[PDB]
Ligand binder design. Structure first.
Ligand SMILES: [Mg+2]
Ligand SMILES: [Zn+2]
Ligand SMILES: [Zn+2]
Ligand SMILES: [Zn+2]
Lengths: 244, 76, 126, 1473, 63
RNA sequence: UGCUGACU
DNA sequence: TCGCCAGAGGACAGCGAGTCAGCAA
DNA sequence: CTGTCCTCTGGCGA
């Protein structure tokens, strides 16, 4: 970031022989796209470049105190006079060559010295990849953190934007085959998930409510749905489900 | 017999997906693959040759259905 | 900002502490920066910036850094992670299960610890 | 091998309480659940029969460990009965309206039997039977109703499966709600007149019957048990065969221990909030079991029994709903809080699960990978694994992956066995991985979990997901040594990514059936057009726009070697020769043009077999931007015939035009949009990639772009004018404010400051905003004067060579408001639409005198960012920038809630094979998607203004897309004949509103009858003397079957899309498209005649082309268009004068559907006749409200004898525009005010402890307090009154009452109308229009002026009033127009096909229903409707009604783990045997 | 008794020396209140002209 | 699990 | 003489996504 | 905070 709110990530490390060298032999060490100025109107960066270049040239140290330079005494006039007094040009543009083709670019570039700060947010602290790992034991879903392995949340907005594509199987994959997917089995006649019970060791799940074991059939169902049926039973509510 | 003759994009997607999941489970490829390791490229190769013996069962909102052949369906 | 946070390392035992190696003082700065000496604790570095559209990788808020400047020490830094190991944990009010120490010859700590169950000062950890 | 069995339906009922037994492994009795060391104490909550809570133990009930044991249920057996907290309130009502003596409900048996029969008929679906039964009753009890009801239920059975539809659930909901709401109040008992044993319940856990006893759940239980017996036939339908026993609990169920996990809380290592509530119940059970034993070993003992009962009920209450009981503490959240909230269990872990095989990292710009690709930084690639099956044709490349290992890139972390599983290769000995590279192909084959392999498909998402384009599929380009995910800049606007720290998620499909859909459907080139309005989304940005605009300009010449190496560097071609061009200049030196570079790059990208496209359009850079020097006039030159403003691509070769943002950009109909139409979405992506590379090479090699200070600078000799204008602007405050207070034009310099101060400290504060506005106008005039001086030509460098211009002017970045405000003016600051606020002393800032007139003191900043802004302007600018930041945060919450509401309702609306948009219930919201099928994306070039483009590219559009074959297989006779019939009809009937009729057509003899025949009669039966002759001649004195005046008067044939199935029927198009095609064919056959270019296309081949292109743009079956409408109304709002604006209005319209809106209005045109114009003046003056307070000078109250003189105003200044007269005004006081005065005096005193003569007499005839008023024979000179209450009254300054009453006292007003006004002009086309707008709403009170005003063309924003005077089909269009006008104020434009669906859904069932929490009550899905809001009320409802769910919604389909019933899941596959 | 305060949380906060400009701003911060972070209306966020010289217009968190 | 910071 | 048009307040329930950390109960 | 929904609530001719 600069001292004017122009934050940005580092996208490339440009080789030092592919950088546009100036007619003085120099070569920039920061390349800043000129399109952040028109909409953000940080005209203080364009003045800091010239002030810092004039400082480095004359061994001085200029002040950037607010409200010290009026319309009559401008900052650009002052620092352009400083530059023109060092053999550079008023408007702060020195003309570069192309470090890749070796030709003097048609436009003269605006170069200078500005003070960069390095921010505390690094990709090394904000990057995550999960394949398989821990699980919330109440719902049997990924745990949900970065210090712990943790999964990223899909979300209801994403669930509603993914089924506007008509991709029902991408939704099935994300929400069902990746987060939680169990084989809870039900009594087909009673249609109840709480009723099938195992035995004491031919291990046959037998329905407790009606003593038959030919009526039990396994169903592929989420795990939070079984948790939901259990917490509903807790309230005496019954979820009767029709198996086909 | 009354629905559109063409193959909607959702139908193409699901048919390619199913044919690919079949090829990947060691199913015979009737398309003479030529060195490609992707089952989805093979499924597209088969769809272009009109060799897919699947029956799209289009469901109407009242339960009534119509069974179309993947061969008898204009792929755009 | 990653800067120079303080002068007394070896003493703080914080959790995280970001340090910039070679800070500089702005060549263009308000005079109040000099009333509260803020150069006792610098925050950034001066860089030669050109405002040019040249790469194709510096668009939409992204920036380009010369590679030789980055290999000559431009904006290098470090973090200090201090971890307080109080070993009254792993136990309750029983016998002292807690003394940093190595039983002699453990194949597990053959040469990574130094006989008081603590890494060497200067050793690299992975 | 999966279970294979699927779910069809889920019903919610209540458990018997006797079948919960046997659903219980053991009864728990030990309160202390945590062992001394933290293990489970036997017989406590955490037990080893209720399942192993953790992997350490094995259950006692079934030997099995955690992760394999389904937990078991247990029961805290209660000492005595307690009421169940959910079925409790109903119980109360079942006891409020009932005779505790008789044990029968106090309702007239008529209502009981009527409702019983209505429920019996609803259970099968019969919906007319409801009103038929009600009318049979009113016209007439059990035998009368049961005959009809049984006849219905018998003749209309087979409909129990077709009863779970909206319109059948709304009726039952309304019936039962009305019953519970109106017929369960306490009433004197029918059979015994004294059966009101008033149950009256205090806070929950307390019911008190009177003779003030406490109702014990056992006595209430017996009362219910004996009331069911008498009234069961009726209640078994109001509750489903509900047993009354379910209303009471004899035990509490402890859920399985695996669902209750011990965590930690302050000073407690192992505790779950649910076990802490159940432990409180167990502890009360133990204290109560002791008191019972104390009675057995035997008023305080039983008062204590009744107090411990009330305490025990609340723990079970708290156990069910943390906040049911508010007087208890140590109350952790119940189940209502486990289920129902944003944290909840539905909006989290149900709709928003967490996913495996996903990555998240900061995204970085790439640009050297194709637009359909993502760069993966070799750290995800080595972890993200796809589990591919091993087969004969892949076992070779899989073998290399298992050999490469878990850590080298084309490798694999594991291999799953046929029957076993999960033999991990992660070892790094490199020999066992080879030991297992064999035995691949050595049932289900081994599956190798391979890494990402540089062609894989990945779903990428940015987290504020507001549209479909926020999730797109990309093609896994693997990059080495990074931790960032690299993405092309064309895909930025789709995600809203900005490369300033912009973490993004990447999901890895794992099924091979979601890969097919990521490739076909979710791909990132099918996403070129936004679904909101079909306009392009992908496009180049920033310096790819300033590069292409400066290369395609006219004076750019390149030598052979810069021409080349600029073509090959954009192409990077891989196959086949590069087709070059010829130099434009061949002689002095061979040279190229830069437009030729783009040309030759365009003829290589377009697919080899297809032919280059023709294109004609406009550029973004106006042809006026280049005019340096004053323009002169040449007699035959239309300067625009040869201008850089017109883009002319002729056979893929750019011949003219700059090609700025208008192409390459996010603008429609450009070069890339036409490429995407004629040649597909992959070719447009290729064009974008190659053009980006070319425009980067150009700026990097030969040119350069920068932005210095000499392009923001301003010429001298132009800043002098700016300075003089700024000096002049410092003198415009006094005049502005003064002439806005309507003060004497001059001579007052301090009265103005005082008037401003008064207006500032006023109460209404609308004479202050007047000054603010009339001051802003002056300042804005001055600001506009200053911009013109400097910005156009006062700049040191002009547009071709200025770097700021040519960046805002080619659409690269910024607007013209930014270029200024950097030079020559910053502007007038406005915070809330007003100037900065003043202090409490009248100064806006400590630097400014109080009430200072200078515009500088009000936020008019004349400084620019070029030369900074002084300290006060920096503060005012800071208030405005902060208002913006505070505001953006508030807006995101408001918009996001509105999207969820619309999304939750419209989610299941999908286009179906019949082409109807139908809800999941089967309900038909629309019969064609937007009134014509047609998807908003594919309808962009079907707009007249583009047949010109489709005609030019006929050959590619026919060859590449439609094909000449489809014309061969397509037949139009059925549809063509229909349109011929329609055309003939409309030819015989030019005026289609002329009351066609057979008999009406047999009124042409009108003269024949009026001549002599009917001259002798009267109005026999009210008709006429001459009408009876016509009736006689027509009736039976005409031919039997040849009296065919019918055919001359028959209806227009019904539209073709209605009868002829637009999908399978060629030439069956919309009635508005065929008109456009006719118009264009007629205007195109008359252009070919004078064309000097050979056209090999015929009008009747162009017609078939357009008809095919229509038939193919037809909204594929399964589209799910309701979700698209939801997201299209949401995204624009989420992002972004006497009416409402913004999200307030959208929420009034959609979410609230209010009958009370903040700003109701009307607009009737004025009839355009000389008499009407004269009458309207009186009409406006007639409907404005005149209130006693608006006509009064001051009161004079004397005081127990309280006199009052009103002293009314003179007519000079209020009769002008109020239409009032003094006799009417005074008569008003005598009959309304002077009696409302005594009404208010009683309002206070009830809780305190020749001709003058007749008027006075009648007035005191009616009231006993007044004595005598006055009279004013000369314009209301002195009109007082006198009262007296002589004994004892609170003598205070009653002026307060007679002033608070003389304000809300209005002489006369039309109900609902507060003021009218005639906005003179509303049209330029027919400027003569006049409109009588209003600020109230009363539709009928305008019907009396059908001759002064046009009552057709009447409009109102109310939508509930329109729906009551004109119907619901007329409110649909008002809804649509309101949404459109709300979006229009911001330039947004949602496609009409979305508002049509929203309005059709809202007005589906006959009423304007809100799109909110009360609109879902009429919804056939209990699993939906509880995933939205108030999940516990919707669960209690669904439970006490036995409501059944069909698992057809998206929510009900994602809750039970099914595949949604739209889009890709809408059909089977049925492999044939 | 809440001490005549109206707030019962966020009374003391961690002072972190990430920089000396993060640290020096903890002893010049003034919090309108922790309850106002939960409000529909935004009128305690208006930067009135009476905080001229007493509160900085620019130095406010921006979320 | 909550309170404090912080990112878009 | 209280039913229904009017009329009042009281209660509830909603308040954008998704991330990372520390500290402490 | 703002909205509907909800629950009453006593008050003149039929
Ligand atoms: Mg950003
Ligand atoms: Zn059973
Ligand atoms: Zn078990
Ligand atoms: Zn009775």
């Amino acid at each position: 970031a600069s001292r004017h709110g122009q934050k940005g990530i580092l996208s490339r490390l440009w080789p030092a022989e592919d950088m546009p060298f100036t007619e003085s032999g120099m070569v920039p060490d920061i390349l800043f796209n000129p399109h952040g100025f028109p909409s953000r109107m940080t005209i203080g960066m364009l003045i800091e470049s010239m002030a810092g270049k004039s400082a480095a040239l004359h061994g001085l140290c200029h002040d950037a105190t607010p409200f010290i330079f009026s319309e009559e005494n401008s900052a650009l006039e002052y620092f352009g006079e400083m530059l023109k007094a060092a053999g550079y040009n008023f408007y702060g543009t020195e003309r570069l060559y192309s470090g890749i083709s070796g030709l003097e670019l048609e436009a003269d570039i605006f170069i200078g010295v500005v003070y960069y700060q390095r921010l505390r947010h690094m990709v090394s602290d904000k990057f995550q990849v999960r394949t398989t790992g821990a699980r919330d034991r109440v719902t049997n879903q990924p745990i949900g953190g970065r210090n712990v392995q943790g999964g990223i949340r899909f979300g209801e907005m994403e669930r509603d934007a993914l089924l506007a594509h008509g991709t029902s199987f991408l939704l099935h994959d994300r929400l069902f085959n990746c987060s939680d997917r169990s084989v809870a089995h039900v009594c087909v006649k009673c249609g109840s998930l709480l009723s099938p019970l195992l035995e004491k060791p031919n291990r046959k799940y037998n329905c407790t409510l009606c003593s038959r074991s030919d009526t039990i059939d396994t169903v592929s169902v989420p795990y939070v749905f079984r948790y939901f049926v259990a917490e509903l039973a807790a309230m005496n509510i019954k979820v009767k489900l029709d198996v086909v | 017999r009354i629905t559109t003759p063409y193959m909607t994009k959702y139908e193409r997607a699901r048919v390619l997906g199913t044919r690919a999941l079949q090829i990947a489970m060691c199913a015979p490829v009737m398309v003479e693959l030529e060195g490609e390791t992707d089952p989805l490229l093979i499924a597209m190769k088969e769809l272009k040759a009109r060799k897919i013996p699947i029956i799209i069962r289009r469901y109407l909102p009242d339960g009534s259905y119509e069974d179309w052949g993947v061969d008898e369906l204009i792929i755009t | 900002t990653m800067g120079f946070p303080l002068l007394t390392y070896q003493d703080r035992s914080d959790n995280k502490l970001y340090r910039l190696q070679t800070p500089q003082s702005p060549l263009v700065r308000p005079s109040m920066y000099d009333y509260y000496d803020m150069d006792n604790y610098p925050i950034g570095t001066n860089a030669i910036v050109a405002v040019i559209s040249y790469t194709g990788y510096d668009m939409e808020d992204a920036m380009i850094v010369n590679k030789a400047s980055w290999e000559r020490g431009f904006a290098h830094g470090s973090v200090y992670k201090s971890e307080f190991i109080d070993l009254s944990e792993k136990i309750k009010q029983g016998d002292s299960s807690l003394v940093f120490g190595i039983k002699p010859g453990d194949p597990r700590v053959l040469q990574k610890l130094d006989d008081d169950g603590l890494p060497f000062i200067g050793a690299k950890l992975q | 091998n999966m279970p294979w069995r699927r779910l069809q339906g889920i019903s919610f009922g209540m458990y018997s309480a006797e079948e919960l037994k046997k659903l219980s492994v053991k009864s728990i009795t030990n309160p202390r659940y945590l062992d001394s060391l933290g293990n489970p104490s036997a017989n406590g909550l955490y037990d080893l029969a209720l399942g192993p809570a953790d992997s350490k133990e094995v259950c006692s009930t079934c030997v099995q460990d955690f992760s394999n044991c389904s937990g078991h249920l247990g029961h805290i057996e209660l000492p005595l009965t307690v009421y169940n907290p959910l079925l409790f309130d109903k119980l109360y009502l079942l006891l409020r309206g009932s005779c505790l003596n008789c044990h029968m409900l106090t309702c007239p048996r008529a209502v009981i039997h009527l409702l019983l029969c209505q429920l019996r008929v609803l259970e099968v679906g019969a919906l007319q039977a409801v009103y038929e039964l009600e009318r049979i009753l009113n016209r007439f009890i059990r035998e009368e109703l049961e005959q009809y009801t049984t006849e219905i239920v018998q003749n209309n059975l087979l409909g129990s499966q077709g009863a779970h539809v909206k319109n059948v659930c709304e009726s039952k909901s309304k019936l039962i709600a009305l019953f519970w709401k109106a017929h369960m109040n306490a009433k004197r008992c029918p059979h015994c007149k004294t059966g009101r044993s008033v149950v009256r319940k205090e806070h929950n856990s307390k019911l008190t019957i009177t003779f003030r006893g406490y109702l014990t759940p056992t006595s209430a239980r017996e009362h219910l048990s004996a009331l069911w017996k008498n009234e069961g036939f009726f209640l078994n339908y109001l509750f489903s065969r509900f047993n009354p026993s379910v209303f009471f609990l004899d035990f509490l169920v402890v859920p399985p221990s695996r669902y209750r996990p011990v965590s930690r809380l302050g000073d407690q290592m192992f505790t779950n909030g649910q076990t802490v509530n159940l432990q409180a119940v167990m502890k009360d059970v133990v204290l109560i079991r002791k008191l019972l034993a104390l009675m057995a070993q035997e008023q305080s003992l039983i008062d204590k029994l009744y107090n411990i009962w009330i305490r025990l009920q609340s723990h079970v209450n708290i156990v069910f709903d943390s906040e049911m009981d508010k007087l208890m503490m140590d109350k952790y959240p119940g189940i209502r809080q486990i289920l129902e909230k944003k944290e909840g269990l539905f909006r989290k872990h149900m709709m928003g699960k967490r996913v495996d095989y996903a990555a998240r990292s900061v995204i970085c710009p790439d640009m050297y990978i194709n637009t359909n690709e993502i760069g993966i930084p070799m750290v995800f690639a080595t972890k993200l694994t796809y589990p591919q099956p091993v087969t004969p044709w892949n076992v070779q490349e899989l073998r290399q992956a298992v050999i490469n290992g878990p850590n080298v890139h084309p490798g694999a972390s594991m291999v799953i066995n046929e029957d076993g599983s999960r033999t991990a290769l992660s070892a790094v000995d490199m020999t066992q991985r080879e030991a297992v590279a064999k035995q691949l192909l050595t049932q289900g084959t081994k599956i190798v979990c391979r890494h990402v392999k540089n062609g894989d498909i990945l779903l990428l998402n940015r987290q504020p997901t507001l549209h479909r384009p926020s999730i797109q599929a990309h093609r896994a380009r693997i990059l080495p040594e990074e931790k960032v995910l690299r993405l092309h800049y064309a895909n930025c606007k789709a995600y809203n990514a900005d490369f300033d720290g912009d973490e993004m998620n990447a999901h890895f499909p794992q099924s091979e059936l979601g890969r097919a859909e990521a490739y076909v459907l979710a791909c990132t080139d099918q996403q070129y057009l936004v679904p909101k309005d079909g306009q392009p989304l992908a496009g180049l940005i920033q310096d790819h726009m300033v590069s292409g605009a400066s290369m395609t300009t006219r004076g750019c010449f390149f030598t052979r070697e810069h021409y080349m190496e600029l073509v090959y560097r954009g192409l990077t071609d891989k196959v086949g020769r590069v087709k070059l061009l010829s130099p434009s200049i061949l002689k002095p030196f061979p040279l190229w043009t830069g437009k030729q570079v783009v040309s030759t790059l365009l003829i290589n990208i377009i697919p080899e077999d297809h032919i280059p496209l023709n294109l004609s359009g406009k550029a973004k850079i106006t042809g006026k931007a280049w005019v340096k020097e004053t323009p002169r006039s040449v007699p035959g030159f239309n300067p625009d015939s040869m201008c850089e403003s017109q883009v002319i691509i002729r056979e893929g070769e750019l011949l003219c035009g700059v090609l700025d943002k208008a192409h390459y950009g996010s603008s429609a109909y450009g070069l890339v949009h036409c490429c995407y139409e004629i040649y597909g979405g992959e070719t447009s992506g290729k064009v974008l990639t190659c053009l980006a590379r070319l425009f980067t090479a150009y700026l990097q090699l030969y040119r350069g772009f920068t932005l210095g200070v000499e392009d923001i600078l301003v010429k001298p000799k132009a800043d002098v004018k700016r300075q003089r204008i700024i000096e002049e602007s410092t003198h415009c405050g006094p005049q502005a404010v003064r002439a806005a207070l309507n003060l004497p034009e001059a001579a007052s310099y301090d009265e103005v400051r005082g008037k401003w101060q008064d207006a500032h400290l006023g109460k209404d504060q609308r004479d202050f905003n007047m000054i603010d506005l009339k001051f802003k106008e002056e300042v804005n005039h001055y600001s506009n004067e200053i911009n013109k001086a400097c910005m156009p030509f006062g700049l040191h460098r002009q547009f071709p060579e200025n770097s700021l211009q040519m960046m805002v002017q080619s659409g690269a970045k910024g607007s013209t408001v930014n270029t200024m405000q950097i030079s020559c003016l910053l502007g007038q600051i406005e915070l809330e639409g007003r100037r900065p606020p003043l202090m409490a002393s009248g100064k806006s800032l400590p630097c400014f005198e109080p009430y200072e007139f200078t515009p500088r003191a009000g936020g008019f900043v004349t400084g620019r960012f070029l030369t900074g802004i002084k300290p006060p302007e920096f503060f005012f600018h800071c208030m405005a920038g902060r208002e913006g930041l505070v505001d953006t945060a508030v807006k995101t919450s408001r918009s996001g809630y509105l999207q969820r509401c619309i999304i939750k309702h419209l989610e299941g609306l999908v286009v179906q094979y019949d082409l109807t948009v139908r809800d999941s219930d089967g309900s038909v919201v629309q019969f064609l998607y937007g009134e014509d099928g047609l998807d908003i994306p594919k309808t962009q070039f079907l707009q007249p203004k583009q047949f010109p483009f489709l005609a030019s590219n006929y050959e590619v559009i026919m060859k590449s897309q439609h094909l000449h074959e489809v014309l061969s297989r397509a037949d139009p006779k059925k549809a063509l004949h229909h349109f011929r019939a329609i055309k003939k009809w409309q030819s015989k009937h030019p005026n289609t509103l002329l009351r066609r009729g057979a008999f009406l057509s047999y009124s042409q003899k009108i003269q024949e009858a009026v001549k002599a025949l009917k001259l002798e009669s009267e109005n026999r039966n009210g008709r006429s003397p001459g009408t009876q002759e016509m009736l006689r001649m027509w009736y039976e004195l005409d031919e039997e079957s040849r009296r065919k005046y019918q055919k001359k008067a028959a209806a227009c044939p019904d539209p073709s899309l209605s009868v002829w199935r637009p999908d399978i029927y060629f030439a069956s198009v919309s009635e508005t498209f065929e008109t456009k095609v006719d118009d264009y064919s007629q205007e195109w056959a008359a252009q070919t005649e004078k064309s000097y270019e050979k056209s090999e296309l015929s009008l009747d081949r162009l017609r078939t082309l357009l008809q095919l292109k229509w038939q193919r743009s037809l909204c594929e079956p399964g589209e799910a268009v309701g979700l698209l409408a939801a997201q299209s109304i949401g995204e624009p709002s989420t992002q972004m004068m006497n009416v409402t604006l913004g999200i307030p209005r959208l929420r009034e319209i959609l979410m609230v559907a209010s009958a009370n809106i903040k700003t109701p209005m009307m607009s009737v045109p004025v009839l355009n006749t000389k008499k009407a114009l004269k009458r309207v003046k009186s009409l406006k003056k007639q409907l404005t409200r005149v209130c006693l307070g608006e006509v009064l000078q001051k009161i004079d109250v004397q005081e127990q004898v309280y006199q009052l003189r009103f002293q009314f105003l003179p007519h000079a200044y209020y009769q002008q525009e109020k239409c009032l007269r003094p006799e009417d005004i005074l008569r008003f006081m005598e009959t309304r005010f002077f009696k409302l005065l005594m009404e208010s005096i009683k309002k206070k005193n009830n809780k305190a402890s020749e001709a003058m003569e007749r008027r006075v007499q009648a007035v005191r005839e009616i009231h006993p307090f007044i004595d005598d008023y006055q009279y004013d024979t000369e314009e209301s000179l002195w009109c007082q009154v006198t009262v007296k209450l002589p004994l004892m009254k609170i003598n205070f300054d009653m002026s307060s009452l007679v002033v608070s009453l003389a304000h809300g006292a209005v002489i006369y007003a039309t109900k609902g109308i507060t003021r009218c006004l005639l906005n003179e002009t509303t049209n330029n086309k027919n400027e003569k229009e006049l409109v009588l707008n209003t600020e109230g709403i009363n539709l009928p009170e305008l019907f009396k002026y059908a001759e002064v005003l046009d009552l057709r063309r009447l409009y109102s924003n109310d939508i509930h009033a329109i729906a009551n005077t004109y119907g619901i089909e007329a409110a649909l269009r008002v809804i649509e127009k309101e949404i459109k006008d709300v979006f229009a104020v911001y330039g947004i434009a949602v496609d009409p096909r979305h508002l049509s669906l929203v309005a059709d859904y809202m007005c589906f069932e006959g009423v304007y229903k809100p799109l909110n929490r009360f609109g879902i009550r009429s919804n056939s899905s209990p699993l939906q409707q509880m995933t939205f809001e108030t999940s516990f009320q919707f669960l209690k409802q669904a439970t006490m009604l036995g409501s059944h769910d069909e698992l057809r919604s998206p929510s009900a389909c994602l809750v039970v783990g099914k595949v949604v019933r739209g889009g890709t899941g809408l059909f089977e596959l049925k492999q044939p045997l | 008794t809440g001490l005549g305060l109206l707030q019962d949380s966020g009374l003391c906060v961690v002072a972190d020396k990430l920089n000396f400009i993060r640290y020096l701003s903890h002893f010049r911060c003034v919090h309108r209140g922790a309850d106002f972070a939960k409000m529909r209306t935004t009128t305690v966020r208006r930067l009135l002209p009476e905080s001229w010289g007493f509160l900085c217009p620019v130095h406010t968190p921006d979320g």
